[PDB]
Amino acid sequence: AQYEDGKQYTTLEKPVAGAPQVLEFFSFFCPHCYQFEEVLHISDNVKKKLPEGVKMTKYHVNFMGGDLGKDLTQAWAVAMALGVEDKVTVPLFEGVQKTQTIRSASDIRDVFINAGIKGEEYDAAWNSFVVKSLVAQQEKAAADVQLRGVPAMFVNGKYQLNPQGMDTSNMDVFVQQYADTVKYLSEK
Predict the structure, then answer these.
(1) For the chain, which terminus, N or C, has the lower number of CB atoms within 10 Å?
(2) Please, where are the H alpha helices in the chain?
(3) Could you tell me the CATH number of the domain that includes residue 100?
(4) Whole-angstrom Cα distance, residue 145 to residue 16?
(5) Contact (Cβ atoms closer than 8 angstroms) between residue 23 and residue 141
């Protein structure tokens, strides 16, 4: 076929029920994740080829960057709770990987302040049990698919994108292959 199991995607031999339709995992410490966000705009190009109404989920992971890795998972929970993902994603990526000015939870917090989230509102979210359950959800979703590397995308809890099996000579061609594959899996 044109799309083959083990080629553009792999199948989970242990499918995950009740899973989000399009589930993406990343880490702010993850170098391909930086590219996926800043250079390729994967998430956005996938959305543009999915129907309207199809919900897309993106979660942070703990297994990179030790203590600061976990802080970032909690900060992403804050971002999701406040709906400010599109305001902090880029400065968090650049703070960790480009300027390397993010070295503590206080430095993460600074990114949110600079993006215009008020201190009171950030600290309250950070310490809230809504955010605690949002952290729980991120951990549970990664554990369900026994996640050991990022970036990762899962469709309907049963297919996993395999970007290693796409051409990378052209960046634009790579992104559309990736997006078209998601659409195909979506329709499967």
Answers:
(1) N
(2) 31-38, 42-47, 66-82, 85-93, 105-114, 119-127, 129-144, 171-187
(3) 3.40.30.10
(4) 7
(5) yes
